[PDB]
Each structure stands twice: as structure tokens, then as C-alpha cells.
Amino acid sequence: DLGKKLLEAARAGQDDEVRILMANGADVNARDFTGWTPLHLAAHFGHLEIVEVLLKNGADVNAKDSLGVTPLHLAARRGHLEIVEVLLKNGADVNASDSHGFTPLHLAAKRGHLEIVEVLLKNGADVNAQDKFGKTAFDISIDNGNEDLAEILQ
């Protein structure tokens, strides 16, 4: 399957191969036992050019994991702000919750990423929302010990 060679290229960061596979119509919705799509991989491992090329090609922006996770979740947890914005412009559910109740904000506030937390907030992300534990963006920031993130989310 070309779909597999796509998952390898999307993860590896080979734009040239990825574009080529685009020419050849390799499945853009290909999956692996984890449910991760080429867009999942690219968002997680942070390559933008791929993300855009993938989105231009009909990829599900709100593709979910077997555990409910999405590309925004992946990009927010990891550090890529540029990826976050591109994803949001294409219709990524800002309030997408995990099987465990985690949203893109939680993963962001959990790891800090103040610059990414602001972007998610100005897009209608709940303050309110609770993860399985019942922690909220503020609960996660205070416990973590981030005073700067406490002001933003307050």
C-alpha cells in the first residue's frame, strides 16, 4: 500500500516523498493500529509543510485516536505553535476531548507552552473544562507551579 509509505514519509518529514505520494493518490486517511493518520504523525513530529499539503488533500482535521486523541491534541502537547494555528484555520475542534477528558488546552497548560495557550484561548477554548480527574486549565497550572500560566488563565 502507498498509504503506508505515506505514514513513513509524514513521520520522517520527507516533503518530497509526501508530495509525490499526493500526485499518486496515496490514501490520506491511512491508519495504523493506534489510529494515527499521516496528519497525526506530522502534527506530532512537527512538520508544517506536510501538514498543509495533507490538509490541502482532504485529510480529516478532526481525526481521532483509538483513545480519542486528535491532531490539535498532539500539536498542543508538543510544542508546535505554527502547527496549532494552521490546524485551527482548517476547522480543528478546539474543544475536542480525549477518552480521558483531556482537551488541547490541558495538554498545553500541562507542559507550559504559554504562547500556545493564548492561541487556543482566543479561539473559544473552555476555561471550564474538566479532565477525568476534574482538573481544569487553572488547576493544572497551579499544581504544576507555573505562575505565568496562572495569570493568563484567570
Partner: protein, 1026 residues
């Protein structure tokens, strides 16, 4: 001195007998193996961590051990990897000449002192430290054709009934078991455990208490009260022995009277220590024994010893339990040794024929028949003294020496005959005169041949180990040949040779011999007429010479190089690589599909297929596998269409259709090592694993932009795969009265498996493993089935105090010299040298992200001396001829014969399409050595005639060249014929025979046809200039 043993024939016989005896004794108490030890000493520290990922193993075991490998002597480099099968393996390689015993004990000791720093379960399991540079003599497969016992059943039997017996057998040094003995297995059930408010913590606690060896005292023990009459020992509780006893282990006694047994919450049975690997032999469950040869032991006497012991323990095998021999190096040694004796025998018969064809008398043809065998037996003694052994290298080393041995014998005998025929001198005084003509020449030759062969035994590392065998072997035979040619042979001539009247060249005699003599005696005129005309036009031939030299250089650099010729070992391997996350079941289908291909589309050539599911030389896990294919005899696979390379390529091309995985066949190395490089990419800062992977990919992509320099540049490891991370919330846990220890044990034991303690099975100590039943530990949705008892006594699900997420991690983490790394393999593009492809890789690596270093390991290290050694060699040779002739100039007329022998070898090698390997190179040195010997004699005679009877330059050269025609012709005729069998040899170690054959025959023809014409020219032009 010849004149000493000419008057004392009996003394010479004593020496001959002593040499024979000493040799005979040596050829009986001398080790026998396929190859000597060539690889540098290497020690491997192996450790296991049941249920541990690649990351955990490295950060708790690999790193702790690596930091303690200091203070050890003669380390070249350290290497290690950490798999997701819970295994770690640290290999330390040492300088050549390092006592492997001392090296291992130093590694072992440092490891001991680091043992207290390792995880508990890693200590329980134990840490191994073994010499890894060793090679298997054979592997003994043990299958069950009855289908009445699993591979665990076979394994346990082999370990408790065979492993020990084989180990004690004479000759075997080490024995590896391809499996594991039984082990008590407790397959827990989370649904049941929760029903009785129990956890894997309870199950473990109960087993450690109701299955242990409790120490008690004695009755009437010291100090006793006076009057005590008996003193008996007290026996307490002792470890359990049966499956039934374990199931009876008490866990909880309900408040209603009933009890809960271990049997009630888990299935109890005997299984294997692990289930990672599953082995099959032609589709049948199998196990085996990897057997190694003890040092100094005889491989043949050992292979026969193990087959006797196996047959001696045969009547005790269970039903349908048969043993097979998938791998065995014994046949190679038998064939090798047999073909050496054969060659040596038919070499004496040929020398006998050519000796009788030219000399035409039995008494003379008898002399070489004695001199040659004496020297052979003698060199075996010389080898023994140095500590060498009979092996493939030293064996061929002699079949190349017979040419120099037969020569020295033919030269002494023929010269005596030629003298008596040119003057009415009786044998005794003819031998004195004859020897007086070649005494100095023979000694000088011994020096020259030493100067040619001895420097070759100075190459460093592995490559030096190989040359050292040939060199020392050939030099010994050479020096022992001259010695016999100055003692035994001269005595045998002045005693066994009959008088021959002056002018009697058998020119008039009956029949063939009479015709042959007139024919040859007239051809010696046609020959001296040609040389006479040649010496009238030397300029024309100086030009032809340069053409030969130029052609030599061209044909030399255009010849591909390989270290040792590839062979058909009757076996080959096929790798199997499934995608990431691929299950053991899937891998099995592909292996069945591979085995089904061999036992069908190759039934004529394939004997068996040993499918090992879960193993790989560059990575392990459920998604990997190997198939060891064993072929039928070489007498059942005729033609190149049925050899390994033909079958391999045809197999690889057939497995390409499989869209499920990457499957390809490939012949194994000649010696267990290849070509290409061993590049090591090193994280020299704190970059991490992901940053290192990027630097690798970046370099791999760059090397892809040089298909004219770099080919097949690939990573020698595994690729990152999705992992299932669990996040235990510390807060909610403490908020429910649940201990983190309880959590990480019920999880670690149920899903990972925990080794609890030991029990005795039929008088043998074995392990006890606790672990969840398969159906309760397969998917992420099963984690919720597991409950943990809190302080309040309530059972709390895992889905209450944890979360999860998919992640990426390495299944196999590598390290080099204490730092993170990734191995990179490659080779030089066709036509380019490794020294060029290496230089390029260094350049590409110099442009990598800051904090990324590199280094060379293995072959690529111990990587440079050839010209330096043959510059010293070239000099010593010169100085020798200089002293032999008392001249600074004359030596040149001898050293010019070198290219004449080389060109022919290059023609043959290139024509047949062979490589410039070690067999070829050694074949050259012997050709060069022999052709040089001819020149030395022709020059010695010519120079002598000028100094003695004051003959002219041309007059002397023509007379000298005439006298040397027959000797040179004879030894060359008997040589070529005796090598023919090697050149045409097919199958069975031919790859080696063909190398030593084509290289020699081609070079031997050109080195005599051209030398008899060119050396008279060299002498003249040199004598004219200087």
C-alpha cells in the same frame, strides 16, 4: 654442508628419520579446526529484565554497567544495545594478542562490583559474562516428529538429559541451549482475583511464603547437655515440586469457612521461562544445542565424540524425539584435509612421471619421492612448535608450498645427472661438483624467499592472523626444503645414482625414449637459437617488457578485491521483517510461507528449514524472524544452477511478491566478516534520541546523493514504534488509599510477568513466574479489568486513577563507548575503494548538527601497511642477491622477473572473473618466489662461467640458459598438472581451490614461458650498463 653428508650417508638418514618421527608425532598431537582464531578477543555481558522496555533496561542496567567498565586492560571499544524484549547486551572488544581469559576476568570483576547498583529483578535473573569471539562447531537440532510434545517439552528434556552429557564429552568447550527448561507458570485471572478482593501482590506474597526452604537446626546439636545419645538434623519446609502443590497454595480463608486456593484464581502449569521465540524444523516444534570447540581440541575427534554420546543416550529419548544436524562444519574439514592429502599424493606421482620421462631411470626418480615427504612431515613439527594447527589456511598453505619443495628436489637431482652426462664423473665426485655449483645459490634463495614471505606475517589485526598462517607455513616448508637439499638429497645422489657415460644423452636408444631424447635435444638447440637471436635485438624486447608491466598495472587496479572467496557452505539464511506492531502470529504465517517455498519449489536442493520466529542479528521482537536453510549434499546439487548463490537470488526474487513484509535470502560469510563499513553515529552532547535520529536520516539522505561512491548505506538497527504510555495520577491514588507499590506490581506482574522464586522439578531447580492469562492482557481495553485493593479494603479499577496516550519510542537503543549511537552500514560503489567511500562518509558527517560525532568500528577499524612492508621486503631481497653475487647491480636482473609471473595470474583471474583475495595474493608470492628461484640459478651459472673459465657475456648466458632448460621445464610441467584438479574443482570448498588454482596456473605458465626468454635478456642489459 653437502660434502659432509656425501661421505656420511647414514648420518643424513638419521636426520631424515628424526625429522620424520618428530613430524609424525606432531601430526598426531596437533589441533584440527576449520579456521584459526582471527577475530580480536571479545567479551559479552548479557542481562535480562522481565517485562522491561528498551528505555528502562538502558537507564537502569546498560548505563550503570557501562560506567563501571573502567580499569580494564587493552580495551579497543565498547558496544551495547537494549531491546524491548527486556534484554541488554554489552560487548567489549580487546587488542589483538590479549589473553582472552585475563580480559574476561577483568570484565567480570568490574561487573560484580556494580551488581549492587542494579534493579532487584535484574539481579535475581542474573548477569552473564561470556567470550563471544568463539564459533560453533555444529548445532544439534532436537525435534518431535510425533507431535506429542511442544518446543518447551523438547527444551526441558535437552537441558535435563542431554546438555550436561554433551558438555562433558571430549573436545567440546561450551554448549548453548536454544531454548529454556521448564518453569512453574501461574496464569492469573483478574476477574477472579477481584471476586475475592485479591491482587497479584497477594499471589506473590503467598508463593514466597508457602514455597521456600526454611532453615531449622538439629537435635542434640553442639553445645549439647552431657548424656545426649543422638544427633539428628531437623527438616522444615522445603520448596515445592509439583504443579498440584502450587495450586493448593492458600491465599485467603473466607469468614464462611471456605478457603481460596491459588488454583481458584489462576491456571497452574509447566511452561517455558519465556515465549518470545518459537522455533520449528520443517514445520515441526524444535529445540537445539549450539556446540563450540574447546581450545587445542580436534574438531573431527570431537564431532565423532558428540555423535557417539548422542547415540549412547538415544535409547532414552521419548517417543518421536529425533536429533538433526542443521549446521555442521565437520564435513568442510574432512573434505579440506582429504583434498590436501590427495593433492600431495598425486603431486609425488606426477613428479615421478616427469622425472622418469626426462631422466629415464628409477633410481633417480626415487630421490624426490623421499626428499618431499621428509620435508612435509618436518614442517608439521615446525608448525606444532610454533603452536599452530591443521586448518583450512595452513592446509592450502602447504599445497602452495609443494611447488617449492618439488623444485629443490628436482634441481639437485637433475644437476647431478646433467653433470655426469657432460663428463665421465662417477656419482660421488659428480655430486660434490654439482652441489658446489648450487650450494650458495640454494642458501641465497632461502634468504630471498624469507624476505618475500616473512614481512607478510606482520600485518596487524584480523587480516594479519590470516596471512600469518600462510606465511609461517610456507616459510617453514621453504627453509626445511633447502635444509634437506643440503643434507639428505646430496647423500641420496652420491649413493643411489648409477654412472652415465660422457656424451650419453640417450639420443640413440630404442623406441619412445630414444625419440623423445632426440626430440628434446634438438629442441634445446632451437631454444638456444632463439635466445641467441633475441640477444642480438635486446631493444625490441625491452619495449615488450614495458608493455607487460603497463598491462600488469592496468589489469591490477581493474581487478575487484574481496578478503576471502565466497563459498557454498551447504547452508544459507533468509531474513524476515514485519511492519511495526506486527504480531507473532502474523510473522509465523510469513515464515510458514517461506518454509513452504523451500520444501516445494526447491525440494531437490533443500533438506530442511529451521524457522526461528522472533530473532534477528540486528533486532529482535515479535515482528522479526530468521530461516536457517540447510541444503542437501554437494553431490545432489549439480551445476551452478543448484548452488547457494543461484538458489538465494531465485528465492529473494520469489519472496518479493509478499506484500506483508520484507523477505530476502543471503549467503553467510566465509568466516564468521564482510565488506563495506561499520559507521557509528554518536551523540556527543546531550542531544537525545530524536535529535540523533534526525542527524542519521540527514546523513542517509546525503549518502543517497552519491550512488557513484556510496551504495547500500543503511541503518543497522530498528525503527521507532508506537508505545502505550500509562499515566498514574498520584493524587487520586493517595485519595483512594491505594499504594503506588501495589499499582506498579499488579501492573508490572500481570502484564510484564514477574519472576518470584524457585522450586524443584525432578531434582532440578527451576524458576516460578507469575503473570496474567493471555486473554486478560492483550488490548488497552483490558487494563480496566484489573482491580487494586485499597486501605479501606475496597477494590479500585485501573480506569479510576490513570490515563493513557499513544507515544513513540525505540524498540532497540544502541550505545558506543558509553554514549548514545546508531550504527550505519554501507559499501563502496562498484569500482571505488573502501578507503575512498570512508573518506566521503567522514565529509558528510562533518556537516551534521552541532554535537554529533562519529567513529569507525570493526572491520573499518583495524583498517595501510602493504607498501611499507613490501618496501622493507623489496630492500632485504635486494641486499640478499647483492651478497650472493658480490655485486650492487646484478641483483636487478633477478628482481625484474616479478611482473612476468604476475601478469599471467592477472590474466587468469580476470578471465575467469575471480577476485584479488588472500588466496590469490599468496598464490602470487609463491609464483614470484619460484620464478625468482629460476632467475637466481640462471644468473648464478652465467656469472660463474664468466668468473671461472672466463667466458664471454653472451657465451656464458647461452650456456647457462641451456643447462637450466630441462630443470625449469620439468618442475613447471609437474607443477601445472598437479594444480589442474584445483582450477576445475567445483562445489565443496572450491571457492578456495579455484582461487589458489587459477591464480597459480595462469601465473606459472607465463612465468616460465617468458622467463626462459626474458631473464637471459635482463642479465645481458644489466651487465652492459653496469
Amino acid at each position: 654442508m653437502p660434502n659432509f653428508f656425501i661421505d656420511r650417508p647414514i648420518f643424513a638418514w638419521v636426520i631424515a628419520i628424526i625429522i620424520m618421527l618428530a613430524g609424525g608425532l606432531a601430526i598426531l598431537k596437533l589441533p584440527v579446526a576449520q579456521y584459526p582464531t582471527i577475530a580480536p578477543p571479545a567479551v559479552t555481558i548479557s542481562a535480562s529484565y522481565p517485562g522491561a522496555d528498551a528505555k528502562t533496561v538502558q537507564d537502569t542496567v546498560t548505563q550503570v554497567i557501562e560506567q563501571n567498565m573502567n580499569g580494564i586492560d587493552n580495551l579497543m571499544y565498547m558496544s551495547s544495545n537494549s531491546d524491548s524484549t527486556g534484554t541488554v547486551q554489552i560487548t567489549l572488544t580487546f587488542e589483538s594478542g590479549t589473553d582472552a581469559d585475563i580480559a574476561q576476568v577483568q570484565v567480570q570483576n568490574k561487573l560484580q562490583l556494580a551488581m549492587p547498583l542494579l534493579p532487584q529483578e535484574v539481579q535475581q535473573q542474573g548477569v552473564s559474562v561470556e567470550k563471544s569471539s568463539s564459533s560453533f562447531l555444529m548445532v544439534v537440532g532436537v525435534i518431535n516428529t510425533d507431535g506429542t510434545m511442544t518446543q518447551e517439552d523438547i527444551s526441558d528434556y535437552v537441558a535435563a538429559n542431554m546438555k550436561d552429557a554433551i558438555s562433558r564429552t571430549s573436545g567440546v568447550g561450551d554448549v548453548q541451549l536454544f531454548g529454556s527448561q521448564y518453569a512453574m507458570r501461574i496464569w492469573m485471572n483478574p476477574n477472579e482475583l477481584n471476586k475475592f478482593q485479591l491482587t497479584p501482590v497477594d499471589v506473590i506474597t503467598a508463593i514466597k511464603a508457602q514455597n521456600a526452604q526454611v532453615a531449622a537446626g538439629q537435635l542434640g546439636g553442639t553445645p549439647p547437655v552431657k548424656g545426649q545419645q543422638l544427633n539428628a538434623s531437623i527438616i522444615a519446609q522445603t520448596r515445592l515440586t509439583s504443579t498440584e502443590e502450587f495450586g493448593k497454595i492458600l491465599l485467603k480463608v473466607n469468614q464462611d469457612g471456605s478457603r481460596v486456593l491459588l488454583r481458584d484464581v489462576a491456571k497452574i502449569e509447566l511452561g517455558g521461562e519465556n515465549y518470545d521465540i518459537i522455533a520449528e524444523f520443517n514445520g515441526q516444534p524444535a529445540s537445539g544445542l549450539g556446540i563450540k570447540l574447546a581450545t587445542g581440541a580436534n574438531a573431527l575427534d570431537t564431532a565423532a565424540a558428540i555423535r557417539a554420546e548422542l547415540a549412547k543416550m538415544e535409547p532414552f529419548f521419548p517417543s518421536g524425539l529425533k536429533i538433526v544436524y542443521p549446521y555442521d562444519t565437520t564435513p568442510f574439514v574432512k573434505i579440506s584435509i582429504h583434498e590436501v592429502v590427495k593433492t600431495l599424493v598425486e603431486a609425488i606421482i606426477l613428479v615421478f612421471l616427469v622425472m622418469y620421462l626426462f631422466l629415464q631411470n628409477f633410481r633417480a626418480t626415487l630421490i624426490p619421492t623421499i626428499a618431499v615427504p621428509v620435508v612435509l612431515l618436518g614442517t608439521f613439527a615446525v608448525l606444532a612448535a610454533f603452536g599452530f594447527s591443521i586448518n583450512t589456511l595452513t592446509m592450502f598453505g602447504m599445497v602452495l608450498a609443494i611447488g617449492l619443495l618439488v623444485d629443490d628436489a628436482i634441481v639437485v637431482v637433475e644437476n647431478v645427472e646433467r653433470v655426469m652426462a657432460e663428463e665421465g664423473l662417477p656419482p660421488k665426485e659428480a655430486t660434490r661438483k654439482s652441489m658446489g655449483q648450487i650450494q650458495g645459490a640454494l642458501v641465497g634463495i632461502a634468504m630471498v624467499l624469507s624476505a618475500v614471505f616473512v614481512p607478510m606475517a606482520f600485518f596487524g589485526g584480523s587480516t594479519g592472523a590470516i596471512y600469518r598462517q600462510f606465511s609461517i607455513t610456507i616459510v617453514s616448508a621453504m627453509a626445511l626444503s633447502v635444509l634437506v637439499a643440503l643434507i639428505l638429497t646430496p647423500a641420496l645422489c652420491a649413493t643411489m645414482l648409477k654412472p652415465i657415460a660422457k656424451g650419453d644423452h640417450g639420443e640413440g636408444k630404442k623406441g619412445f625414449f630414444g625419440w623423445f631424447n632426440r626430440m628434446f635435444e634438438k629442441s634445446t638447440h632451437h631454444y638456444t637459437d632463439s635466445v641467441g637471436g633475441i640477444l642480438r635485438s635486446t631493444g625490441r624486447y625491452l619495449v615488450l617488457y614495458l608493455i607487460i608491466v603497463v598491462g600488469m598495472a592496468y589489469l591490477f587496479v581493474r581487478l575487484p578485491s574481496s578478503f576471502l572467496p565466497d563459498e557454498d557452505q551447504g547452508v544459507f539464511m533468509t531474513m524476515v521483517q514485519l511492519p511495526a506492531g506486527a504480531t507473532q502470529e502474523r510473522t509465523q504465517k510469513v515464515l510458514n510461507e517461506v518454509t513452504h517455498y523451500y520444501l516445494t519449489k526447491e525440494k531437490n536442493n533443500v533438506e530442511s528449514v529451521f524457522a526461528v520466529n522472533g530473532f534477528g542479528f540486528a533486532g529482535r521482537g515479535q515482528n522479526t524472524g530468521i530461516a536457517f536453510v540447510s541444503l542437501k549434499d554437494w553431490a545432489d546439487r549439480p551445476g551452478e544452477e543448484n548452488k547457494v548463490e543461484a538458489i538465494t537470488m531465485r528465492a529473494t526474487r520469489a519472496f518479493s511478491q509478499i506484500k506483508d513484509a520484507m523477505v530476502f535470502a543471503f549467503n553467510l560469510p566465509a568466516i564468521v566478516t564482510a565488506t563495506g563499513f561499520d559507521f557509528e553515529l554518536i551523540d556527543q552532547a546531550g542531544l537525545g534520541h530524536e535529535k540523533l535520529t534526525q542527524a542519521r536520516n540527514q546523513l542517509l539522505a546525503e549518502a543517497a546523493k552519491h550512488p557513484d561512491m556510496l551504495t547500500s548505506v543503511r541503518p543497522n538497527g530498528l525503527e521507532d514504534t508506537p508505545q502505550f504510555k500509562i499515566d498514574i495520577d498520584q493524587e487520586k491514588a493517595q485519595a483512594l488509599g491505594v499504594s503506588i507499590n501495589d499499582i506498579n506490581t499488579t501492573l508490572g506482574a500481570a502484564w510484564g510477568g514477574s519472576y518470584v522464586n524457585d522450586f524443584i522439578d525432578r531434582g532440578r531447580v527451576k524458576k516460578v513466574y507469575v503473570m496474567s492469562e493471555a486473554k486478560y492482557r492483550m488490548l488497552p481495553d483490558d487494563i480496566g479489568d484489573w482491580y487494586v485493593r485499597a486501605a479501606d479494603g475496597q477494590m479500585v479499577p485501573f480506569s479510576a486513577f490513570s490515563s493513557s496516550r499513544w507515544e513513540y519510542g525505540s524498540p532497540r537503543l544502541e550505545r558506543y563507548n558509553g554514549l548514545p549511537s546508531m550504527e550505519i552500514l554501507g559499501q563502496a560503489a562498484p569500482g571505488k575503494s573502501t578507503g575512498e567511500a570512508m573518506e566521503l562518509m567522514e565529509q558528510l558527517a562533518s556537516k551534521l548538527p552541532t554535537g554529533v560525532g562519529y567513529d569507525w568500528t570493526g572491520m573499518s577499524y583495524q583498517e595501510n601497511q602493504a607498501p611499507s612492508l613490501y618496501a622493507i621486503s623489496l630492500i632485504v631481497v635486494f641486499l640478499c642477491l647483492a651478497a650472493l653475487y658480490e655485486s650492487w647491480s646484478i641483483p636487478f636482473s633477478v628482481m625484474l622477473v616479478v611482473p612476468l609471473g604476475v601478469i599471467g595470474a592477472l590474466l587468469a583471474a580476470t578471465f575467469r572473473g575471480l577476485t584479488n583475495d588472500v588466496y590469490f595474493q599468496v598464490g602470487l608470492l609463491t609464483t614470484i618466489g619460484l620464478s625468482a628461484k629460476n632467475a637466481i640459478l640462471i644468473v648464478e651459472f652465467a656469472k660463474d662461467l664468466m668468473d671461472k673459465e672466463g667466458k664471454g657475456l653472451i657465451e656464458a648466458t647461452l650456456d647457462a640458459v641451456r643447462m637450466r632448460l630441462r630443470p625449469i621445464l620439468m618442475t613447471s610441467l609437474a607443477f601445472i598438472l598437479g594444480v589442474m584438479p584445483l582450477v576445475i574443482s567445483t562445489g565443496a570448498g572450491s571457492g578456495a581451490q579455484n582461487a589458489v588454482g587459477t591464480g597459480v596456473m595462469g601465473g606459472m605458465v607465463t612465468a616460465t614461458v617468458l622467463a626462459i626468454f626474458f631473464v637471459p635478456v635482463f642479465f645481458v642489459v644489466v651487465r652492459r650498463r653496469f
